[PDB]
Homo-oligomer: A and B are copies of this chain.
Amino acid sequence: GAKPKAQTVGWRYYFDIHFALGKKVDEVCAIRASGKTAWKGSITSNGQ
Give A residues with C-beta under 8 Å from B.
1-3
Number of copies: 3
Tell me the nearest residue of chain B to A1, going by C-beta.
B3
Per DSSP, are chain A's interface residues mostly helix, strand or loop, or mixed? loop
CB distance from A1 to the nearest CB of B (A): 6
Tell me the nearest residue of chain B to A2, going by C-beta.
B1
CB distance from A35 to the nearest CB of B (A): 14
Q: Which residues of B contact A2 (CB under 8 A)?
A: 1-3
CB distance from A9 to the nearest CB of B (A): 12
4 A-B interface contacts by CB (under 8 A): A1-B2, A1-B3, A2-B2, A2-B3
Q: Which residues of B contact A1 (CB under 8 A)?
A: 2-3
